[PDB]
Design an enzyme around this catalytic site. Sequence first.
Site, PDB file in Angstrom:
ATOM      1  N   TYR C  40      -6.265  59.385  61.389  1.00  0.00           N
ATOM      2  CA  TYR C  40      -5.126  60.300  61.427  1.00  0.00           C
ATOM      3  C   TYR C  40      -5.523  61.728  61.757  1.00  0.00           C
ATOM      4  O   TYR C  40      -6.665  62.134  61.547  1.00  0.00           O
ATOM      5  CB  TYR C  40      -4.376  60.287  60.096  1.00  0.00           C
ATOM      6  CG  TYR C  40      -5.173  60.898  58.976  1.00  0.00           C
ATOM      7  CD1 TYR C  40      -5.008  62.239  58.624  1.00  0.00           C
ATOM      8  CD2 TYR C  40      -6.109  60.139  58.277  1.00  0.00           C
ATOM      9  CE1 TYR C  40      -5.756  62.809  57.596  1.00  0.00           C
ATOM     10  CE2 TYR C  40      -6.845  60.682  57.255  1.00  0.00           C
ATOM     11  CZ  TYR C  40      -6.674  62.017  56.917  1.00  0.00           C
ATOM     12  OH  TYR C  40      -7.439  62.543  55.898  1.00  0.00           O
ATOM     13  N   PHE C  51      -4.657  70.620  59.602  1.00  0.00           N
ATOM     14  CA  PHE C  51      -5.112  70.883  58.244  1.00  0.00           C
ATOM     15  C   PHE C  51      -6.036  69.785  57.740  1.00  0.00           C
ATOM     16  O   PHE C  51      -6.802  69.997  56.792  1.00  0.00           O
ATOM     17  CB  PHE C  51      -3.933  71.091  57.286  1.00  0.00           C
ATOM     18  CG  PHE C  51      -3.033  69.894  57.146  1.00  0.00           C
ATOM     19  CD1 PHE C  51      -3.318  68.891  56.220  1.00  0.00           C
ATOM     20  CD2 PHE C  51      -1.882  69.787  57.912  1.00  0.00           C
ATOM     21  CE1 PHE C  51      -2.481  67.785  56.086  1.00  0.00           C
ATOM     22  CE2 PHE C  51      -1.035  68.694  57.779  1.00  0.00           C
ATOM     23  CZ  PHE C  51      -1.334  67.692  56.867  1.00  0.00           C
ATOM     24  N   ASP C  52      -5.960  68.619  58.381  1.00  0.00           N
ATOM     25  CA  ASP C  52      -6.703  67.446  57.947  1.00  0.00           C
ATOM     26  C   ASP C  52      -6.804  66.443  59.080  1.00  0.00           C
ATOM     27  O   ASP C  52      -5.815  66.170  59.762  1.00  0.00           O
ATOM     28  CB  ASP C  52      -6.016  66.800  56.738  1.00  0.00           C
ATOM     29  CG  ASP C  52      -6.949  65.897  55.931  1.00  0.00           C
ATOM     30  OD1 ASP C  52      -8.196  66.028  56.065  1.00  0.00           O
ATOM     31  OD2 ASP C  52      -6.421  65.063  55.153  1.00  0.00           O
ATOM     32  N   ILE C  71       0.860  60.483  50.092  1.00  0.00           N
ATOM     33  CA  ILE C  71       2.189  61.078  50.125  1.00  0.00           C
ATOM     34  C   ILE C  71       3.212  60.062  50.613  1.00  0.00           C
ATOM     35  O   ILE C  71       2.888  59.184  51.423  1.00  0.00           O
ATOM     36  CB  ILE C  71       2.227  62.329  51.030  1.00  0.00           C
ATOM     37  CG1 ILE C  71       1.706  62.012  52.434  1.00  0.00           C
ATOM     38  CG2 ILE C  71       1.422  63.449  50.397  1.00  0.00           C
ATOM     39  CD1 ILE C  71       1.928  63.104  53.433  1.00  0.00           C
ATOM     40  N   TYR C  97       4.280  67.473  50.694  1.00  0.00           N
ATOM     41  CA  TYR C  97       3.849  68.204  49.501  1.00  0.00           C
ATOM     42  C   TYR C  97       4.932  69.080  48.882  1.00  0.00           C
ATOM     43  O   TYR C  97       4.671  69.832  47.955  1.00  0.00           O
ATOM     44  CB  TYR C  97       2.530  68.955  49.753  1.00  0.00           C
ATOM     45  CG  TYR C  97       1.408  68.017  50.161  1.00  0.00           C
ATOM     46  CD1 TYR C  97       0.582  67.424  49.205  1.00  0.00           C
ATOM     47  CD2 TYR C  97       1.199  67.697  51.500  1.00  0.00           C
ATOM     48  CE1 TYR C  97      -0.441  66.547  49.576  1.00  0.00           C
ATOM     49  CE2 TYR C  97       0.190  66.821  51.882  1.00  0.00           C
ATOM     50  CZ  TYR C  97      -0.629  66.248  50.918  1.00  0.00           C
ATOM     51  OH  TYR C  97      -1.631  65.376  51.312  1.00  0.00           O
ATOM     52  N   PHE C 114       1.883  63.976  61.663  1.00  0.00           N
ATOM     53  CA  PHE C 114       0.658  63.213  61.578  1.00  0.00           C
ATOM     54  C   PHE C 114       0.579  62.305  62.775  1.00  0.00           C
ATOM     55  O   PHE C 114       1.591  61.799  63.246  1.00  0.00           O
ATOM     56  CB  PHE C 114       0.637  62.361  60.309  1.00  0.00           C
ATOM     57  CG  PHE C 114       0.259  63.121  59.081  1.00  0.00           C
ATOM     58  CD1 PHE C 114      -1.065  63.145  58.647  1.00  0.00           C
ATOM     59  CD2 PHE C 114       1.226  63.814  58.350  1.00  0.00           C
ATOM     60  CE1 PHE C 114      -1.426  63.853  57.500  1.00  0.00           C
ATOM     61  CE2 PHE C 114       0.884  64.532  57.199  1.00  0.00           C
ATOM     62  CZ  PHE C 114      -0.444  64.548  56.769  1.00  0.00           C
TER      63      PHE C 114
END
Lengths: 4, 124, 123
Positions: C40, C51-52, C71, C97, C114
């Site tokens: 991902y 961010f990730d 999540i 979040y 994502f």
Amino acid sequence: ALPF
Amino acid sequence: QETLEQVHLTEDGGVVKTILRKGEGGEENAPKKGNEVTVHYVGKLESSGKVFDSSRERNVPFKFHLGQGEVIKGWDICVASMTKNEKCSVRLDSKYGYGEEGCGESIPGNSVLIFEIELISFRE
Amino acid sequence: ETLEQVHLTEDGGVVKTILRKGEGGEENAPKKGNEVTVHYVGKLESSGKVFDSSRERNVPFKFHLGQGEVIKGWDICVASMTKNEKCSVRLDSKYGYGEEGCGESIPGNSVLIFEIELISFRE
């Protein structure tokens, strides 16, 4: 007509 | 409690396809631009639910060439996404149908059209 | 030619755009509790900033589907995927979040996007  | 998967084929939500019956899963089963497709369909207005056009009433399949402007926009986009023996219900916004003018008595200006389209076969 | 996005919720807070279609067999569909292996990339919608990413790390991420290990938006998204499906899921605040967000990298009320590729899974 124009078109179907 | 079953609910059916409807897929947006445009970015404006003006072509939303609900698949009532999945087709066949092979690449061989997917129709290409210019292929002659054979379909059966029923066209009704969204608001009134009134049938304006049906190849089933006629008991004769409808044949056209995919992706060539032989049919209203929404059809070219919708059929392009189908596979052999897929049956669907496509919701078409005004601009993917007959637009601001509509068509005859049966289709007013700015009509949302709903078509049930079964892809029977295709060929080169 | 445009891409087919599907609303996986009734509030428009999980919209999946399938970039690459998966495999079409039932054997290719992951069930609740199954260990799923994914790659991902997570970026904010507004800033477009990553961010990730499991790709940065060069290592796939493994979790159990449908058990709140991830999540909400993920559990809903991956549940609707099949083997080797790639996709871009748009997640509203409440499906990620929420009102707090998560650290510097994710502010309160962030819409997350994502790109999730489902590599494999197992029972």
